[PDB]
Amino acid sequence: VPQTVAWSAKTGAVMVLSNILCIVAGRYVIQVKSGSFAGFGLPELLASTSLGHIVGSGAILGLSYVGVL
Amino acid sequence: HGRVAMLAAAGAIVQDIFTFPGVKSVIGDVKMTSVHDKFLSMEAGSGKGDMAAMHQLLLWLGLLEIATSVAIIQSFKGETSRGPGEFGFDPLNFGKGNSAGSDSYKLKEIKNGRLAMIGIGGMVHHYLLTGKGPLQFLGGIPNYKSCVSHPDSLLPWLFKAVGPVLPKIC
Amino acid sequence: AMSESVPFLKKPEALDSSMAGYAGFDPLGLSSIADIKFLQESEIKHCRIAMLAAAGSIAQDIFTFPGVSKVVGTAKMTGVHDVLVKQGAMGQILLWTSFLEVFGTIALLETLDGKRAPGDFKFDPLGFSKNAETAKRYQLSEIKNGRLAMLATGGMVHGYFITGKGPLELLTNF
Amino acid sequence: ETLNLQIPSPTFEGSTGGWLRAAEVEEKYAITWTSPKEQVFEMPTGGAAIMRQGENLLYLARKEQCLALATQVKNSFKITDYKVYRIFPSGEVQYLHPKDGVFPEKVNAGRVGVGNVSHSIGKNLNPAQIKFTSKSFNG
Amino acid sequence: LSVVAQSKSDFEISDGTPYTLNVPLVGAASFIGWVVPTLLPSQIALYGGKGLSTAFFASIGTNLAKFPAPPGMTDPFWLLCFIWHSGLFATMILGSIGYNGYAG
Amino acid sequence: SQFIKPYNDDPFVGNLATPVSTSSFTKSLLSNLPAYRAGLSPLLRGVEIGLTHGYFLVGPFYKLGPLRNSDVALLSGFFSALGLIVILVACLTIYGVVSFEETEAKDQLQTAKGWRQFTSGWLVGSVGGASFAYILISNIPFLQTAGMSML
Amino acid sequence: NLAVPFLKAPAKLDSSMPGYAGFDPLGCSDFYDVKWLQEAEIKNGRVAMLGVVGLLVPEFFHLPMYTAGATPYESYTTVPAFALIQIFLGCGAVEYFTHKGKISPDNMFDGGRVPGEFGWGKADMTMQTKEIKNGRLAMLAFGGILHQQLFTKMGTIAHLTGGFKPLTF
Ligand code: CLA
Ligand code: CLA
Ligand SMILES: CCCCCCCCCCCCCCCCCC(=O)OC[C@H](CO[C@@H]1O[C@H](CO)[C@H](O)[C@H](O)[C@H]1O)OC(=O)CCCCCCCCCCCCCCCCC
Ligand SMILES: CC1=C(C#C/C(C)=C/C=C/C(C)=C/C=C/C=C(C)/C=C/C=C(\C)C#CC2=C(C)C[C@@H](O)CC2(C)C)C(C)(C)C[C@H](O)C1
Ligand SMILES: CC1=C(C#C/C(C)=C/C=C/C(C)=C/C=C/C=C(C)/C=C/C=C(C)/C=C/C2=C(C)CCCC2(C)C)C(C)(C)C[C@H](O)C1
Ligand SMILES: CC1=C(C#C/C(C)=C/C=C/C(C)=C/C=C/C=C(C)/C=C/C=C(C)\C=C\C2=C(C)CCCC2(C)C)C(C)(C)C[C@H](O)C1
Numbered sequence: 001v002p003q004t005v006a007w008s009a010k011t012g013a014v015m016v017l018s019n020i021l022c023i024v025a026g027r028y029v030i031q032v033k034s035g036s037f038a039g040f041g042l043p044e045l046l047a048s049t050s051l052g053h054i055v056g057s058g059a060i061l062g063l064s065y066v067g068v069l
Numbered sequence: 070h071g072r073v074a075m076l077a078a079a080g081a082i083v084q085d086i087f088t089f090p091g092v093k094s095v096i097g098d099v100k101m102t103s104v105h106d107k108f109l110s111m112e113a114g115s116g117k118g119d120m121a122a123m124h125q126l127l128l129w130l131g132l133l134e135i136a137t138s139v140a141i142i143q144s145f146k147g148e149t150s151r152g153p154g155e156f157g158f159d160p161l162n163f164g165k166g167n168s169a170g171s172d173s174y175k176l177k178e179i180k181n182g183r184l185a186m187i188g189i190g191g192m193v194h195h196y197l198l199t200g201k202g203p204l205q206f207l208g209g210i211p212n213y214k215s216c217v218s219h220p221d222s223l224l225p226w227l228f229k230a231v232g233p234v235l236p237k238i239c
Numbered sequence: 240a241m242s243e244s245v246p247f248l249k250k251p252e253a254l255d256s257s258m259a260g261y262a263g264f265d266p267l268g269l270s271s272i273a274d275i276k277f278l279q280e281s282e283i284k285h286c287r288i289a290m291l292a293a294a295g296s297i298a299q300d301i302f303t304f305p306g307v308s309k310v311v312g313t314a315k316m317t318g319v320h321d322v323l324v325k326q327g328a329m330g331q332i333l334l335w336t337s338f339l340e341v342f343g344t345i346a347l348l349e350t351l352d353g354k355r356a357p358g359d360f361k362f363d364p365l366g367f368s369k370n371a372e373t374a375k376r377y378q379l380s381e382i383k384n385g386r387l388a389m390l391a392t393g394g395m396v397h398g399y400f401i402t403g404k405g406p407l408e409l410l411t412n413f
Numbered sequence: 414e415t416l417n418l419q420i421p422s423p424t425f426e427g428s429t430g431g432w433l434r435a436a437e438v439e440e441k442y443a444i445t446w447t448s449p450k451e452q453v454f455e456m457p458t459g460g461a462a463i464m465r466q467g468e469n470l471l472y473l474a475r476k477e478q479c480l481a482l483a484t485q486v487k488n489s490f491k492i493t494d495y496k497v498y499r500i501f502p503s504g505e506v507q508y509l510h511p512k513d514g515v516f517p518e519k520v521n522a523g524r525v526g527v528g529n530v531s532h533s534i535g536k537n538l539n540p541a542q543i544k545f546t547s548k549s550f551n552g
Numbered sequence: 553l554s555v556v557a558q559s560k561s562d563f564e565i566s567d568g569t570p571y572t573l574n575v576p577l578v579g580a581a582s583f584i585g586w587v588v589p590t591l592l593p594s595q596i597a598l599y600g601g602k603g604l605s606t607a608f609f610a611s612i613g614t615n616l617a618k619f620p621a622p623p624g625m626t627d628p629f630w631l632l633c634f635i636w637h638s639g640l641f642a643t644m645i646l647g648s649i650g651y652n653g654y655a656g
Numbered sequence: 657s658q659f660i661k662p663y664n665d666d667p668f669v670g671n672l673a674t675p676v677s678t679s680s681f682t683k684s685l686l687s688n689l690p691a692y693r694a695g696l697s698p699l700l701r702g703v704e705i706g707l708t709h710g711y712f713l714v715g716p717f718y719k720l721g722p723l724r725n726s727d728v729a730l731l732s733g734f735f736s737a738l739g740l741i742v743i744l745v746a747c748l749t750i751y752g753v754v755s756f757e758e759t760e761a762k763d764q765l766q767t768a769k770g771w772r773q774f775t776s777g778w779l780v781g782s783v784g785g786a787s788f789a790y791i792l793i794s795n796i797p798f799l800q801t802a803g804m805s806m807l
Numbered sequence: 808n809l810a811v812p813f814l815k816a817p818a819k820l821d822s823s824m825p826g827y828a829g830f831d832p833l834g835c836s837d838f839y840d841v842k843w844l845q846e847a848e849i850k851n852g853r854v855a856m857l858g859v860v861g862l863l864v865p866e867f868f869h870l871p872m873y874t875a876g877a878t879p880y881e882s883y884t885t886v887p888a889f890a891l892i893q894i895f896l897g898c899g900a901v902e903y904f905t906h907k908g909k910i911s912p913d914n915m916f917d918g919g920r921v922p923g924e925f926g927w928g929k930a931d932m933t934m935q936t937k938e939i940k941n942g943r944l945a946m947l948a949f950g951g952i953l954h955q956q957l958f959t960k961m962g963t964i965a966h967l968t969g970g971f972k973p974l975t976f
Contacts, residue, residue: 136266140247143249
């Protein structure tokens with residue numbers, strides 16, 4: 001079974017990074033909507049952080065799998 | 070055909086005369102077409118051994134021949150003003166400026182070629198039945214009286230009407 | 240219009256006397272199948288690699304570098320490849336030649352478009368070709384020892400596949 | 414009257430449904446019509462083509478293919494300006510439709526009736542009566 | 553068959569349209585663009601600790617040692633060969649699409 | 657860019673110009689095949705096609721025929737190929753009788769004489785190509801098996 | 808140009824630019840804005856310059872708050888991860904401050920902001936060249952030192968002064 005670890009600040013770090021990464025990506029790649037202060041609303045923010053919890057969950061599970069944690 | 074036959078006829082005669090150093094310890098006492106067989110029993114692919122003698126001949130003759138393949142194909146379709154047989158080979162000036170040669174020397178080449186076709190055909194069949202080889206055959210003008218025990222060729226079927234239908238004096 | 244090297248063949252259409260190392264040798268018509276400039280770059284690449292390969296064979300007979308005998312005991316010509324894949328030497332040379340090939344690939348596309356001559360990487364640090372007449376004869380000599388080293392590299396490695404001796408050890412031990 | 418061979422053809426990208434060797438060795442049919450627009454129509458032999466504003470020209474293998482297009486061109490684009498030709502490989506061009514300038518469903522003077530039988534269909538002759546006789550069954 | 557270069561021959565993909573197949577550039581880039589990621593090792597019995605390209609490149613030589621004999625059904629050669637070429641064909645297809653069409 | 661166009665500029669002919677149909681590679685192969693190659697007599701077209709077809713015919717008859725497991729397998733396979741070649745030549749002859757009117761033209765395939773030329777070449781080439789395959793298989797043990805002599 | 812002589816001049820760069828050497832073989836300058844590219848090169852350089860010291864100095868001296876782990880590289884797995892989280896957000900605040908809300912290629916350089924400059928001054932073309940080339944060097948050196956400490960699993964100068972063991976993984 002792929003090893004997973006109990007929540008630590010390291011798990012938080014990956015999640016925070018991934019959420020911010022997607023918030024910046026969402027400002028760039030969301031085609032229909034002051035780098036983050038133009039046209040930024042809740043559906044844009046709620047979508048980029050939804051992909052952050054998808055990317056972050058995948059990254060956390062993968063880094064636990066290989067040993068990086 | 071004539072050039073190959075001239076080479077084969079001279080080759081059979083000189084093979085009877087002597088052999089190169091070390092050939093005798095490998096092939097033994099075979100004489101003409103049997104030596105073709107003997108090498109081929111000792112060569113990779115056809116036989117089992119450490120030799121590539123007939124295969125080396127096939128390799129380099131085949132390189133030359135594919136070159137002449139393109140030459141003949143070009144000459145057939147009229148793309149070239151080259152005559153038959155002319156490969157430009159005349160290293161010693163014999164035709165005095167033309168590699169094709171004079172009318173007389175190409176007539177000589179064709180006539181000697183035709184003679185050598187007949188002659189090497191005779192030599193091969195005289196060996197296939199007596200086993201003597203050119204010079205022993207020409208010496209042994211009474212023939213079938215005592216002949217050399219020589220192997221069956223790689224085409225033994227062809228020597229199967231000799232005894233049953235034909236007389237088989239041997 | 241007859242081939243110089245093969246007198247009974249027509250002069251190959253795609254071939255021209257401007258090319259370095261030209262002798263009219265393409266009896267199979269392979270200069271028409273693939274583009275002649277791609278073929279020139281391929282041949283020159285083969286020339287230079289096999290020149291290093293032949294010189295490497297010869298030099299590795301003559302001497303080895305300090306500590307090499309520690310790592311390679313009896314492996315001589317292509318056995319040293321097998322033992323130095325285990326060690327890092329072969330991977331290192333592969334990485335750096337592949338690094339160079341990336342820009343070589345850009346340069347091959349460049350010479351395809353027509354901006355660059357094949358095999359031309361502007362590498363003349365010691366100014367050997369400055370005269371403009373030496374430059375041509377150097378191009379001819381590069382292709383000549385390049386072709387000869389392709390044949391030689393093959394002819395040594397196969398001599399070593401037979402005997403195991405290597406080039407100089409084949410000669411000295413007949 | 415004669416087909417002006419130079420009339421431009423509707424923009425079409427081609428299809429496998431067009432004419433075959435029998436058109437170039439037996440006969441070919443052509444249809445011309447005037448379009449007020451540069452509009453898409455359906456080819457009888459396949460997909461869609463675009464007729465150019467002004468005069469168009471097509472070549473088809475069957476007479477029915479030219480008229481099936483004529484029906485469509487008159488029912489959806491209200492073009493009634495269509496002329497159908499038969500073309501032989503000898504170069505002879507044979508005007509076909511409408512044969513005398515007026516459509517067949519409209520009467521015209523100088524049309525002679527062909528195939529008209531003076532009695533009703535039940536008044537034909539029985540086959541036994543005309544057996545081994547050349548006499549026709551239509552009375 | 554034949555390969556056409558990036559430079560302009562008179563090759564036409566169809567009746568009247570000349571089209572430069574970029575067989576040198578696409579084949580080289582697709583090969584390298586697939587082989588280098590595929591160097592990623594994996595301690596799986598099929599790979600054996602190598603990457604997919606390298607386990608495959610290892611399996612060409614092992615079966616070449618037994619040159620007349622073909623690789624067996626359970627031999628890792630076939631799976632490695634199929635997977636390597638599947639990615640290679642895909643990168644060649646995508647590389648031809650990317651290079652010929654987008655031109656940059 | 658578009659790879660499919662109407663066939664020979666004609667949008668209304670029953671064909672398309674596709675890469676399989678009209679690429680430079682296709683045109684090359686078609687133009688250089690014996691049926692379409694220029695400078696070839698119909699007799700020579702028949703010979704080259706015949707040599708090709710007769711040569712491959714010997715193999716399926718030899719390897720998979722009824723006498724395949726016998727020592728007369730190659731003889732039976734050649735004669736089977738020879739029988740097919742003779743049957744096919746009758747097919748060629750009757751096609752010429754019913755398809756072409758008699759005209760002096762003889763350098764085209766689709767003429768009465770040109771077909772008779774092509775049929776003559778095809779029969780000679782087919783027997784020649786089948787005979788060549790017979791000679792090669794008889795003598796070379798690799799061809800007698802599927803390459804199975806090496807294992 | 809002049810760096811890779813068997814290739815063309817990029818013709819999107821010039822000797823006006825600080826660290827110019829004509830080295831753009833892949834032609835990235837053609838596909839992306841060169842103000843953004845310069846910007847990214849200066850920034851990556853400066854961060855990696857700080858990172859070279861960030862790998863060097865904690866070997867000799869590590870702050871009393873933390874525990875140093877085994878190597879200055881490995882120290883991120885032994886310091887509290889929330890400390891690195893605060894570094895991440897603090898650097899984000901600096902990005903959204905030093906850039907006046909402009910964080911995208913379309914947005915930066917709108918008022919004529921020169922790539923390197925963040926308001927710490929104006930420097931000679933030579934001085935900007937010095938920064939760029941040292942930055943490029945420390946980028947390469949950061950790659951070298953990080954993977955060195957990763958493979959050796961020991962510190963950089965301890966490895967250099969002690970037996971210079973090859974990197975093996
Ligand atoms: C497998 C490798 C691969 C992949 C995934 C891509 C993907 C992409 N390329 Mg690239 N390219 C490749 C190889 C590849 N390329 C190579 C080898 C070359 C050099 C010859 C190029 C040269 C090139 C140029 C010059 C350009 C692109 C561009 C693009 C993008 C859109 C156009 C396109 O090809 O649509 C492909 C579309 C997708 C991949 C997304 C669709 C999603 C589905 C699921 C496709 C999946 C296909 C396949 C199953 C994935 C296989 C992966 C692997 C297992 C082989 C896209 C991101 C263009 C671009 O956007 O610029 C950045 C562009 O200008 N490419
Ligand atoms: C809150 C975080 C944050 C934000 C919003 C920014 C914003 C910016 N940075 Mg900065 N940066 C940060 C943190 C941040 N930075 C930190 C902590 C570092 C490391 C010290 C850097 C290092 C850095 C460099 C070296 C460069 C920038 C650049 C940029 C600009 C464009 C990229 C962008 O919009 O964000 C994108 C960035 C982030 C969302 C956070 C970046 C933090 C790094 C990259 C961690 C990412 C981990 C992972 C390896 C990313 C790969 C993705 C994938 C493999 C998973 C913009 C001004 C670039 C530029 O063009 O200069 C203006 C540039 O060259 N920044
Ligand atoms: C007009 C003739 C034009 C060509 C003329 C060339 C020769 C003319 C002069 C000859 C006189 C000297 C005699 C030399 C004889 C040389 C004999 C020789 O070298 O043989 C050469 C070869 C092989 O024969 C032997 O091979 C052995 C190893 O097996 C050895 O290596 C020997 O080299 C070789 O003798 O014979 C052939 O050429 C056969 C024809 C080509 C076969 C190619 C492979 C088979 C392809 C089949 C795949 C197609 C699809 C199959 C479908 C599924 C099937 C299950
Ligand atoms: C061209 C070219 C050059 C060259 C060259 C070369 C190498 C030329 C070689 C020429 C040769 C070898 C010609 C030989 C012909 C042989 C004949 C006619 C004999 C046939 C046998 C008969 C009739 C018989 C018989 C027999 C019977 C049947 C039974 C047997 O028991 C015995 C018996 C023998 C009696 C050079 C290099 C000079 C340069 C020049 O610038 C251009
Ligand atoms: C496999 C292996 C590895 C290796 C390796 C290496 C280094 C392999 C290198 C192989 C090479 C270079 C082979 C070259 C052969 C040359 C030939 C056939 C040319 C013949 C010329 C001819 C026929 C005639 C030409 C001509 C003549 C004069 C007459 C006519 C005119 C013309 C046509 C011009 C390693 C490293 C992994 C080690 C591992 O343990 C084993
Ligand atoms: C190497 C090898 C082999 C081999 C072999 C070889 C080289 C075999 C060569 C066979 C040859 C060349 C036979 C010659 C036949 C010519 C004839 C019969 C002319 C006949 C009759 C007349 C009337 C001519 C009349 C004429 C004259 C008088 C003047 C009038 C006109 C004309 C009619 C033209 C094997 C097969 C043994 C296998 C072995 O394992 C390996």
